[PDB]
């Protein structure tokens, strides 16, 4: 905490950030901008600002508390400022409501004036009272702003899972939302406030792979189920949702997605069965419009087939279901995706291509990314709080064949489909794939049953070609050495190529080599992910019915590397102002699931210093210890 892990951008003229953000209110059109903190401090004097994430917006008193902490740290100790006593004259905090597109800004002065005011889509500076000075729609301002904020906190992590939660906006400081509440449990706050904003949730649009957003498909519901999964707050969510059922019957979907996250498969399956096979079902009544019932039916069947595919796998039943799912929603991505994967797991290479070609692709829609509300002078502090090796900071200046790879830049549905293309090319081989392709697709011009390739699939084929080319080139050039007698960037890149193409241990060990040579966040991330993959693989194969002792030892060692990687990555995040990661919590969760939490903390106490043990205790372990309820 304290004076480091708080980036600062200076401004030549004061009030710059607030002015720019006030000019930008029109074009936002998003989940939102990140919250903006603007500072005027003193012993002229200077103006600063930075972006923040994870604050408690549910009550302005809490925001005053936060700002009071921010001010307090400066007061306790002088500023470094690369070589000064400072104290905040004026502290501004600007957060965004996306249910209703307006921005609320709270200003705290040293004089002690606490102003709260509102800017909307025109830039019309509406004022903001305090509880009739009706009343409930002032509480709901803070409430909606809070839910909007939490959505912006979770979903930015949940949308960037595939790139390891990369953040290209450096001047942001991120907290853990789950631990941010004074006097209120943020997760429980979200649970309580959910039915109030449930209707308005769709207005928030959806992830890119959701082509047709719904009441039960959107950022709000995803934020909900992610929170419930991470916290295991089963009883409260069950309570409120059961309340919400009587009014809104279609939210039985959200109960099911929660039963799954809290791992009651049985009652969730009973539930789906009741929704799809009862005269009492809300799908059955003739009054409600058929297509809006069809969307929800499609979602239900998609949930069922995804359950039957990703776990407890019956490929046949999942197929017979996913076909109905496609029939109920031919224009959705997920249905075709599931059908394609099931086709793959059944060796239907020809069928998959027809279905993969039939997969609708997201146009114009982008995943949520933190953006900058202004277009060299900066302040990037260097935390001495918790530090390990490789903090030594360099200039990694620069195989152009390896960085001009196109599939690295691949986006969204095209990426998720590219993975399936690798999934089949790892079975058929390249040329057999070419033959299969040639037997159903339209080939080269300059007869009938052949249909048209969708030409994003053609590009995927070209990218697959270049990928295989570079991969085999590397593997050859390495196998030629054979210990007769390598660059970290290139280890990352090649590791990513092998990661894409379906070659796991080669990629993993490439990253391992890169981790011997240097430190790379990407290497440690993908390596950790590889360890989790091996963990799940081993533990499920045992479930299937490696010798029990081989199982035990492999589990222990895998956990013992998972801890180390988690620690190093967490320190990497602390170096760059990020206190939050769902990936790391998920990772440590299974170590704590195997061996006691006590024991995990002991194992980190062994290999690491106390600053680091303390940091990890803050940013992961405390949440797992007390901020979930008695699952462990």
């Amino acid at each position: 905490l304290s004076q480091t892990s708080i980036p600062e951008v200076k401004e030549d003229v004061i009030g710059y950030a607030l002015h720019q953000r006030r000019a930008r209110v029109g074009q936002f059109q998003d989940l939102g901008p990140p919250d903006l903190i603007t500072l005027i401090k003193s012993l002229g004097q200077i103006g600063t600002f930075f972006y923040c994430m994870g604050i408690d917006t549910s009550d302005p008193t809490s925001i005053t508390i936060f700002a009071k902490k921010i001010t307090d740290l400066f007061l306790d100790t002088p500023q470094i400022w690369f070589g000064k006593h400072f104290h905040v004259s004026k502290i501004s905090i600007s957060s965004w409501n996306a249910f209703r597109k307006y921005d609320v800004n709270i200003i705290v002065h040293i004089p002690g004036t606490v102003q709260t005011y509102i800017i909307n889509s025109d830039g019309e500076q509406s004022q903001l009272p305090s509880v009739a000075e009706q009343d409930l729609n002032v509480n709901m301002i803070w409430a909606e702003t809070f839910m909007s904020g939490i959505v912006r906190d979770i979903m930015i992590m949940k949308d960037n899972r595939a790139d390891g939660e990369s953040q290209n906006l450096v001047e942001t400081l991120i907290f853990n939302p789950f631990t941010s509440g004074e006097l209120e449990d943020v997760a429980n706050n979200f649970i309580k406030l959910f039915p109030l904003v449930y209707e308005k949730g769709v207005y928030l649009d959806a992830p890119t792979h959701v082509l047709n957003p719904s009441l039960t498909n959107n950022y709000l519901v995803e934020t909900l189920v992610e929170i419930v999964r991470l916290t295991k707050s089963l009883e409260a969510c069950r309570k409120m949702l059961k309340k919400l059922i009587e009014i809104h019957p279609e939210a039985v979907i959200i109960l099911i997605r929660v039963y799954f996250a809290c791992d009651l498969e049985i009652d969730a399956v009973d539930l789906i069965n009741e929704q799809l096979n009862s005269p009492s079902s809300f799908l059955a009544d003739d009054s409600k419009t058929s297509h809006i019932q069809l969307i929800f039916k499609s979602e239900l069947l998609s949930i069922q087939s995804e359950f039957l595919l990703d776990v407890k796998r019956d490929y046949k039943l999942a197929k017979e279901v996913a076909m109905e799912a496609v029939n109920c929603a031919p224009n959705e991505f997920k249905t075709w995706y599931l059908l394609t994967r099931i086709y793959i797991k059944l060796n239907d290479m020809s069928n998959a291509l027809l279905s993969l070609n039939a997969c609708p692709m997201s146009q114009v829609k982008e995943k949520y990314v933190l953006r900058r509300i202004a277009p060299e002078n900066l302040h990037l502090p260097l935390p001495l709080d918790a530090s390990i090796e490789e903090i030594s900071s360099l200039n990694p200046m620069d195989d152009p064949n390896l960085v001009n790879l196109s599939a690295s830049s691949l986006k969204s549905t095209f990426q998720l489909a590219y993975k399936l293309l690798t999934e089949i090319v790892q079975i058929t081989g390249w040329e057999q794939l070419l033959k299969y392709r040639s037997k159903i697709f339209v080939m080269e011009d300059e007869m009938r049953s052949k249909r048209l390739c969708e030409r994003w699939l053609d590009n995927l084929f070209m990218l697959l070609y270049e990928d295989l080319k570079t991969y085999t080139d590397w593997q050859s050039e390495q196998l030629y050495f054979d210990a007769q007698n390598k660059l970290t960037v290139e280890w990352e890149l090649f590791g990513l190529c092998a990661k894409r193409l379906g070659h796991l241990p080669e990629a993993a060990k490439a990253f391992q080599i890169g981790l011997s040579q240097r430190f790379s966040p990407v290497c440690a991330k993908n390596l950790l992910q590889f360890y989790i993959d091996e963990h799940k693989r081993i533990r499920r194969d045992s479930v299937s019915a490696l010798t029990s002792s081989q199982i035990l030892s492999s589990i222990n060692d895998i956990d013992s590397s998972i801890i180390d990687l988690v620690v190093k990555i967490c320190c990497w995040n602390h170096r760059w102002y990020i206190e939050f990661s769902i990936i790391l919590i998920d990772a440590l969760s299974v170590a704590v699931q195997d061996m006691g939490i006590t024991k995990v903390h002991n194992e980190i106490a062994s290999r690491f210093s106390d600053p680091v043990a303390q940091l990890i205790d803050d940013n992961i372990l405390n949440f797992l210890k007390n901020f979930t309820n008695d699952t462990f």
Binding site: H291, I295, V326, A329, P330, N331, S355, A358
Partner: protein, 80 residues
């Protein structure tokens, strides 16, 4: 009828539906936008329909003989 030997019989499933369009799905994974007003009366949704596509060679020569006569008429009237 020569048309019968070259006829094409398809089964389609009636999917998501509008006042304007039904979306129909085959087992070979074609998805078709189709006028709902051309579907039969009880057709609902989640229903199954047979499409029997045949040719017509009488109306082709009919329209050919119509086209030629029209064009010849235009040539007769304006220009020469």
């Amino acid at each position: 009828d020569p048309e019968f030997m070259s006829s094409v019989d398809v089964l389609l499933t009636v999917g998501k539906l509008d006042a304007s369009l039904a979306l129909l799905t085959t087992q070979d994974h074609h998805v078709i936008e189709f006028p709902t007003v051309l579907l039969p009366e009880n057709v609902k949704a989640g229903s199954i329909i047979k499409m029997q596509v045949s040719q017509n060679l009488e109306e082709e020569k009919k329209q050919r003989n119509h086209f030629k006569s029209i064009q010849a008429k235009i040539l007769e009237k304006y220009g020469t």
